[PDB]
Amino acid sequence: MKLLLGDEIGQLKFIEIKKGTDTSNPESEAPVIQKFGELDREKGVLFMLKHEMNVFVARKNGTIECWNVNQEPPILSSLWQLDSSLLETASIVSMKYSNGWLMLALSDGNLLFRHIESSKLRKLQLHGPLSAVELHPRIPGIIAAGGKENDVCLYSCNPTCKSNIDELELWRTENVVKVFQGKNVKNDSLNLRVRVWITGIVFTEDIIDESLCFHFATITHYGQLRFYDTKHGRRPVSTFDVSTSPLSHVGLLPSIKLLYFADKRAQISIFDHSKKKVIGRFQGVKGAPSSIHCLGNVVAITGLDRNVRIFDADRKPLANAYIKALPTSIIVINERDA
Amino acid sequence: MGKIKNKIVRQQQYMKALHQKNKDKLERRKERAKEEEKDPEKKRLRLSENIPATIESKRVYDETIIEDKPDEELQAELKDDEFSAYFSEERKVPKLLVTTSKRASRKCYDFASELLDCFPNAEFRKRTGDIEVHEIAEAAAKRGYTDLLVLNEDRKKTNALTLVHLPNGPSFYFTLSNLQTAKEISNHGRSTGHIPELIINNFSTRLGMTVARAFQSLFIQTPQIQGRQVVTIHCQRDFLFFRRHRYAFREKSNMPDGIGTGLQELGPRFTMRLRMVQKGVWDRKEGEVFFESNAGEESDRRKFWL
Amino acid sequence: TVREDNGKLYLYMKTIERAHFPSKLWQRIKLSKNYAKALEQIDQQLLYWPGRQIHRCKQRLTRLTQYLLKARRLALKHQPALIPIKPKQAHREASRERKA
Amino acid sequence: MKFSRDVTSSRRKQRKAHFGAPSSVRRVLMSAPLSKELREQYKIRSLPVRRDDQITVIRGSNKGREGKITSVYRKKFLLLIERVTREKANGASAPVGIDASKVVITKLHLDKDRKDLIVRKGGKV
Amino acid sequence: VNIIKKRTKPFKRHQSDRFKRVGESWRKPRGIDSCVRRRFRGTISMPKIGYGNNKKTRYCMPNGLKAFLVRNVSDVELLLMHNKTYAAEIAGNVSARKRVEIVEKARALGVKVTNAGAKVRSQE
Amino acid sequence: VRYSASPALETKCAKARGAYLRTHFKNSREVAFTINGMSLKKAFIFLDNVKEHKQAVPFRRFNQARWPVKSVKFFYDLLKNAEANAEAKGLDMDKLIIKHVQVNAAPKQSSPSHIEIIVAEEEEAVPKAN
RNA sequence: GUACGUGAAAUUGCUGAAAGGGAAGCAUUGGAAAUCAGUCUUACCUGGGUGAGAUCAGUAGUCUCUCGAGACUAUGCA
RNA sequence: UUGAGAAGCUCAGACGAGUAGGCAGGCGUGGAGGUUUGUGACGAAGCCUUGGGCGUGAGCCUGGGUCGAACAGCCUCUAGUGCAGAUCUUGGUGGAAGUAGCUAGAUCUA
RNA sequence: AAAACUUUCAGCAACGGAUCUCUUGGCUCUCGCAUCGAUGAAGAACGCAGCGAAAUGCGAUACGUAAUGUGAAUUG
């Protein structure tokens, strides 16, 4: 399973780890990793957007770069340095891809939009402190936002547009309106306000207004995973207290179409949307995971154990490698082995 | 052996078999001695081969242990970390603050004094009120401290030490054991205010290096040789041993160099076991786990993490 | 009787004429959060009952509210956890240390 | 509940039977389950253990690690599994024993007698 | 009504100090010529009904509470309305797991736990 | 085996044990009592004096002087075992002292007696730095 | 660690402590040394603002009971 | 005014030696039917301990240390059920005593 | 008055094998059945195993053969 790993020291490691490669085994062969990039802490990697085979990389100084992995070794296809004035107090919460466009929301509320081809730059203002931002895959120009003391808001650029719209006229500052604001759940048994802190948002309308029935699930800083449905109502359809630890990030597993989540104690599990309970749990991950990525029937997990754990959709450890440095984001380059 | 159920028979069967096992072990030792004294090379090769096993030698193989050759990747990562200000040309002087748990007793106040004795330039403020650890660390950041030590005491016995690195450095949580005061140490000594000389040994693994790195950051970078006070941190099977001594060299024949120092324990004396390493200020619930030990995995006594 | 059920104090009542049907024995009503309105509810529901019986329900409502209050304040404060102690791990670590 | 007076319900008598049983009675006491896909293939639940039967350990320190049965040690109700060993003092391998009701049979040793046993209990190959 | 006792020291058996086969449990000396049974000077005392304590103070701990033995967490709930007079004694064999469930529940209930710090350990 | 002395770990000490030794218990106790605290080489010389009748062991608890040789012979091997175990550790031989010795009763099968011995060091480091 | 589960008392050895003019012994009253008992301003009430929620809507639906009594799902927070 | 375990709660007064002996209420052990939707590998039973308590008392509850697989409170049933003695039975262990002495060596020393 | 010796108390190590837990044993009651030997019984002795210490098993066809089964183990 070829995969690329980012490190906090700014260097990127291309790993050709094959099935069964487990460094904890003394007899096992180590994977052949190739490292490059700047080895300085001021350009720590943050996220591993997977634009088809192309990979887009952010940096702690905003030195966004682009790589194409069809060639070995990969080469820096494109480069971008963000303005130093929008990183003076915030940090890149996420970049995500939507129909040939790049999203670069900041924690301070600012948000930048970049087109790879047209090279158009758009700035958008939002609500208070952002901690989770996402773009709807199927429908272009649908932005979900969340953060501490700021419930989820569904910003939409095209009202319906009935199939899609041209990418140039998306995210117009006058065309963005929130078509859905999350309603905080009722007070708990103690008549205490249920503290709200969104930490990660995923859209699950495929596994469960044009193309209505927005079915998406968010997580919290209080370990409670909350689903959603605009048609049913603003409040969550269901709410579960999965973990005591704050939930780190959430996502989907296309192989079984089953939602997965992790927390800051390294407890990654595969929640079920039909049985309303956690089934299984990825065993053997020590140290909180910095980023988890999955492709088809494989999943790559990296955290403060400084390792690359590999499992399948049915949580069986395939591979394991030691990465010396501190990983920050991972991406499976190829689901199939070398 | 165990087949026959009669008690007195199975004793006689063993004692007869035990005596036979000792007899043939005698003759094989004697003939080995007879042939080895005839050919000293046989003794030489046997000694060079029959090295008795030990837990350190039989240690399970883990890849995180760093090689003797210093790797550039490690230094690149560690030249800009939280403690780097203490290791760079800045040469930050670290000041320590020692606190307790809510409404503790006087047992700690006579052990934290021994802690303060081994830590010159280290204040102490007894915890008062409803202030939590995540709030002390914020306050100490603006006050002018570097690291923060807490001596949790319960049932009038101190058991856990947690320490955080200001302002946002990693937090460590050790469980103290065998904590003996300077009085309960035979041939104890009285210590002065001279700056002790740190010595850190046996921290081969990568995680152990970080824990050793933080402890190094805990000490004044300029030792006072004239006081010749030594503070020892030694890790062996994960049990970190903290000891203090006063060393005065003497002429010792056994040590082939010819010189070897006498040692006098100063106090304190305690163990630690790294229960959990956190990233960010120590939060019991909502912290990030750098490492939390599984208690069932430590049962493999040839496997370690520090 | 007055007994809480998930953060809400309910007033449970039974009668002689429903004593033979265990399922439908205990009629239940909900007592409001406003303590003054809670006591008016008890009297207008327990009326013409013996003063002893209404006396004991008011005390329980008083004593249950103080429970709910204390449960709230304790949650607010960041009280310490209580991690227990195992006799097998304590011994094994005690022996493994001495050898070290 | 037992109802026959031909059976007994005695801890003393049933344990006397268990540890007083000879090998031809111990060969049924040492049975093993079958893998779920193989269990339904022959429509039988459990079969007695046998040398050269490929099995997977399900319980104990040696959980998961597979192998075959080198020899069945009837007099102590144990199964000896190749490569499932233990490092003695002298560096040799004293292979630990697993009880027959913990492992699961994955690939049987198809003898002529085993085939008749399968079809005898309303089964088929 | 304060917790005042007519005597602190226990009643030991006569000659129980000399022998070890003789237990310290109080046994009435029935010896016919027993001068210690005869209440001479320099002898020991002897249990009498005159030594009973105040009936509104019998079974009361020095802080005024009467010990109440709670096995599980169900038992700690029924002390909701006697928290000013009873103290939730935790049984000796209750495991450290349910021991925390008993102490955390009793803390919010308002009742006093007598052995709340046994087998457990705090963590901040 | 767990001994009866808080010292005698690898610090500066070596042990030695005797089990069910076929010597009278009372003699061993008196022999052990007199040699406690002496220098290891001094104790060896004194034991030789007992063999040569130059010095006699006092009899204090089990009573004056006497010259047992069998009990001293048992102690000679244990002390020899003690220094042989010291060498394996690699201690400083010239400063060995008999820090601890203890004789215990054995099963009544002749009255045997377990014997243990602990050798140690005496040290003092000047503080100075005034 | 095969003198092998738990390992009591008698009994013996070592160490530390105090005491030790032909007894000891125990009882009362203390003292001294040594050591444990248990510590708790914190909460209540009142005032306002700020955001809330609901058992509240000059409000809308479903479920089980017996109009209204519960559990909820919207929606607004007066 | 809540004080109906009416077998409860409350009020008043006097009284208190004790053998033989008479009456009454309790404590404790093994097991038995019911029960605590009881406890227990996050440590049962046991054991020790100058930890803390409860009862006039028999006894009880608990902390710590050992320990490792069972156990208990309550209502009744039941009996091989409570020890300081019996020149008591069995096992263990001391003082006596390194004594009476017996195997060497030169009364002494082993 | 300290040591020695004597004494109490505590720590530690011996000694001893109680206590606690069980348990291929005992006892008790019920139930079913009818079966030794001159065709050599019961009992005894001597033998016998790839090696048995007891212990069982066996009789120069010796820790048993034939036959019917089971179907791969005996096991120090």
Tab-separated table of C-alpha atoms (C1' of nucleotides) in Angstrom, chain G residues 50-78:
chain	number	residue	atom	x	y	z
G	50	U	C1'	-26.111	38.869	29.230
G	51	G	C1'	-27.153	34.364	26.089
G	52	A	C1'	-30.271	30.409	26.819
G	53	G	C1'	-34.419	26.049	28.032
G	54	A	C1'	-40.110	24.374	28.815
G	55	U	C1'	-42.884	21.331	33.092
G	56	C	C1'	-43.938	28.293	29.583
G	57	A	C1'	-46.456	29.577	24.307
G	58	G	C1'	-53.709	34.930	23.590
G	59	U	C1'	-49.256	28.003	20.032
G	60	A	C1'	-48.989	23.237	16.336
G	61	G	C1'	-48.472	16.859	16.008
G	62	U	C1'	-47.635	11.614	17.431
G	63	C	C1'	-47.492	7.426	21.421
G	64	U	C1'	-49.609	4.841	26.000
G	65	C	C1'	-53.154	5.514	29.388
G	66	U	C1'	-57.832	7.780	31.712
G	67	C	C1'	-61.640	15.022	28.879
G	68	G	C1'	-56.296	15.234	31.016
G	69	A	C1'	-52.020	12.196	33.163
G	70	G	C1'	-47.577	11.032	31.295
G	71	A	C1'	-43.209	10.237	27.380
G	72	C	C1'	-41.769	12.913	23.089
G	73	U	C1'	-41.264	15.314	18.067
G	74	A	C1'	-41.462	20.427	15.585
G	75	U	C1'	-41.638	25.836	16.314
G	76	G	C1'	-41.056	30.781	19.149
G	77	C	C1'	-38.210	32.310	24.169
G	78	A	C1'	-42.763	36.566	25.390
